[PDB]
Amino acid sequence: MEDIIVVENLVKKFGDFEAVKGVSFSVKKGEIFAFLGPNGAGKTTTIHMLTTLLKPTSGKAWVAGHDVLKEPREVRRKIGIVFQDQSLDRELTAYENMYIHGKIYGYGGEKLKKRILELLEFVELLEFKDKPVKTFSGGMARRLEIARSLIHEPEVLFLDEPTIGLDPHTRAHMWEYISKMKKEHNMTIFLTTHYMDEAEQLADRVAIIDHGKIIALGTPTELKRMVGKEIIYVRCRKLPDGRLELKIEEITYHKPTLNDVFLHLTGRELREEGPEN
Amino acid sequence: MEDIIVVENLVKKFGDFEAVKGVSFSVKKGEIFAFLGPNGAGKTTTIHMLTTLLKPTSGKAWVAGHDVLKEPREVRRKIGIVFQDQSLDRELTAYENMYIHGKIYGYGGEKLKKRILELLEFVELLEFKDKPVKTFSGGMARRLEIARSLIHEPEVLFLDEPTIGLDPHTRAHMWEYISKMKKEHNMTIFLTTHYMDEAEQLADRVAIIDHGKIIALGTPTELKRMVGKEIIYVRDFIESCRKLPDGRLELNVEDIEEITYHKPTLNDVFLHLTGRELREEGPEN
Numbered sequence: 001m002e003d004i005i006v007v008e009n010l011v012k013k014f015g016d017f018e019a020v021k022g023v024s025f026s027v028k029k030g031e032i033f034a035f036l037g038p039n040g041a042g043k044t045t046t047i048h049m050l051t052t053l054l055k056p057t058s059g060k061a062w063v064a065g066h067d068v069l070k071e072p073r074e075v076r077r078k079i080g081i082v083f084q085d086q087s088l089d090r091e092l093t094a095y096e097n098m099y100i101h102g103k104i105y106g107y108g109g110e111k112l113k114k115r116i117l118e119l120l121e122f123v124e125l126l127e128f129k130d131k132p133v134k135t136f137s138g139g140m141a142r143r144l145e146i147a148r149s150l151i152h153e154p155e156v157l158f159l160d161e162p163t164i165g166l167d168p169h170t171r172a173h174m175w176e177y178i179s180k181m182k183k184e185h186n187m188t189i190f191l192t193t194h195y196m197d198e199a200e201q202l203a204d205r206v207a208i209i210d211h212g213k214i215i216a217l218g219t220p221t222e223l224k225r226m227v228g229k230e231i232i233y234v235r236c237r238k239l240p241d242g243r244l245e246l247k248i249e250e251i252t253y254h255k256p257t258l259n260d261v262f263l264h265l266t267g268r269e270l271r272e273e274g275p276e277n
Numbered sequence: 278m279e280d281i282i283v284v285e286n287l288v289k290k291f292g293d294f295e296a297v298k299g300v301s302f303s304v305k306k307g308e309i310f311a312f313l314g315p316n317g318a319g320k321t322t323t324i325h326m327l328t329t330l331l332k333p334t335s336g337k338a339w340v341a342g343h344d345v346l347k348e349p350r351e352v353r354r355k356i357g358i359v360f361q362d363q364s365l366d367r368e369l370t371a372y373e374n375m376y377i378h379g380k381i382y383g384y385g386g387e388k389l390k391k392r393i394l395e396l397l398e399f400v401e402l403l404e405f406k407d408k409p410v411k412t413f414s415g416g417m418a419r420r421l422e423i424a425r426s427l428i429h430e431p432e433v434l435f436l437d438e439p440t441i442g443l444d445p446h447t448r449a450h451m452w453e454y455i456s457k458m459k460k461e462h463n464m465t466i467f468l469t470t471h472y473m474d475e476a477e478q479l480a481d482r483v484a485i486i487d488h489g490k491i492i493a494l495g496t497p498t499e500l501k502r503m504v505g506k507e508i509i510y511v512r513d514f515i516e517s518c519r520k521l522p523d524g525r526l527e528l529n530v531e532d533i534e535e536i537t538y539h540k541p542t543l544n545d546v547f548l549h550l551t552g553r554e555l556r557e558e559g560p561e562n
């Protein structure tokens with residue numbers, strides 16, 4: 001019921017270029033909220049502003065009862081950050097990297113040691129506790145960032161494209177951690193993604209973002225209601241690539257997905273490999 | 278037809294885990310050669326070994342007439358590296374970042390200044406030459422890494438997923454640079470990718486990689502010949518039929534829940550060979 005994220009006309013300009021054009025939304029406590037959009041939509045810029053790493057041009061943002069602009073240190077203490085810019089030390093082991101982060105936030109003793117091992121067990125890295133992070137996979141390093149961000153018991157976890165670059169097994173396990181954090185620990189998760197399957201499967205609500213704007217917002221089912229119950233693509237709404245969204249070149253038929261909602265709103269798709277290029 | 282890259286049973290183990298299981302191939306001079314495979318196939322591990330950034334567990338690799346394992350410094354001087362982890366300083370401008378890399382490799386004077394501006398014009402960043410890299414997008418920073426890797430005139434350019442995370446316009450421009458480097462400058466390009474269109478449109482030859490192994494190797498047309506001329510996915514007219522784990526039926530035909538019909542792509546070759554697709558969003562998950 002309580003709003004743990006409140007954003008009002010959040011804007012970011014890089015010189016004269018508008019990256020984020022005044023986005024607004026709210027996230028309830030214990031919710032998985034996803035920003036779904038393609039590369040270049042303003043997802044990383046938005047998540048950097050919500051986590052205090054980038055100053056907004058204008059607008060307002062409140063995270064966990066605190067003003068992001070006026071109380072960034074109080075906001076940093078209440079949130080977890082897992083971004084593509086890895087801040088792990090390759091020379092230190094997995095356990096050592098998390099002891100460093102734990103002592104920085106004020107934890108210590110046998111209790112900090114137990115917590116680290118528990119969080120390493122939760123992300124399935126307990127067997128690699130005494131192993132250098134230089135010899136770690138991308139998947140392993142991202143699983144270690146999830147465990148590290150949880151040491152200081154944040155209320156909200158911010159994930160910038162959590163499963164980009166990961167194999168299906170690590171990706172499936174990443175979704176289980178997120179799901180378990182929500183359901184078993186009342187955690188709030190704000191994530192950015194261009195994966196329609198990741199947004200449908202995990203998110204309670206989705207904000208579809210395109211060229212710095214929210215172009216649709218609601219539950220995956222409310223968004224899917226904007227398109228038919230059964231869609232056809234043949235090569236009524238004509239698309240730039242030539243096919244028609246309802247003895248030929250290409251015919252496709254399936255149940256609607258959030259990629260079909262993106263095609264319906266913008267005339268193109270979320271993926272890079274799609275016919276748009 | 279000189280082989281500028283020769284790889285023989287190149288292996289990489291991380292503890293007891295086998296990331297690359299003994300891969301072999303060769304790349305001709307002036308060729309675009311692509312490693313096509315899904316996330317976790319061993320593409321980044323292979324490209325890090327070929328560029329001297331990661332030591333192999335075993336095997337042999339020769340790049341531009343030099344042994345990768347015994348002459349890494351001579352190999353580094355002859356190749357260009359454009360990977361994910363950038364080395365660009367956000368405080369320095371685009372021109373300044375290029376001047377740093379140029380002076381490190383032994384260049385200087387008016388000639389280095391001209392070559393920087395040329396390379397910035399080639400990647401369409403000349404108008405942002407005196408602009409900080411902190412104020413650059415991802416596409417611009419990747420275009421700057423391409424220009425930076427070319428300062429020391431490498432014979433081979435190594436690209437680890439050149440267009441991942443880019444918009445279609447920057448992606449289309451990235452393909453144009455690669456094509457122009459091969460055709461207009463006799464450049465050899467080794468690239469890793471999980472995009473079936475990128476490998477088809479750019480590569481002369483493709484090595485399909487899956488779980489640390491090369492499972493198919495040839496031109497995109499030789500590989501497409503392994504599947505029908507027209508494929509159907511459904512969940513007398515059937516020439517061949519193959520059931521998939523997800524439940525669908527891969528049918529090869531001549532002239533319900535979900536039906537799809539299109540001409541074969543390298544993703545249909547990957548699904549024919551392995552029973553799963555290249556993308557993350559595919560039904561496999």
Ligand SMILES: Nc1ncnc2c1ncn2[C@@H]1O[C@H](COP(=O)(O)OP(=O)(O)O)[C@@H](O)[C@H]1O
Nearest residue numbers: 014019039040041042043044045411412413414
């Ligand atoms: N630091 C920056 N300086 C200038 N432009 C930027 C910067 N970061 C991103 N951009 C631009 O802002 C837009 C959104 O970028 P981004 O936040 O990275 O989106 P996404 O994460 O969804 O791919 C793009 O059109 C990109 O070119």
Ligand SMILES: Nc1ncnc2c1ncn2[C@@H]1O[C@H](COP(=O)(O)OP(=O)(O)O)[C@@H](O)[C@H]1O
Nearest residue numbers: 135136137291296315316317318319320321322
């Ligand atoms: N340093 C490492 N330590 C342990 N496992 C690793 C390491 N680097 C990569 N791996 C593993 O090797 C496999 C292949 O990795 P990678 O080369 O990055 O594949 P790709 O680039 O095609 O996605 C993956 O299963 C990955 O987890």
Ligand SMILES: [Cl-]
Nearest residue numbers: 164272441442
């Ligand atoms: Cl992707």
Ligand SMILES: [Cl-]
Nearest residue numbers: 487488492551
């Ligand atoms: Cl296999």
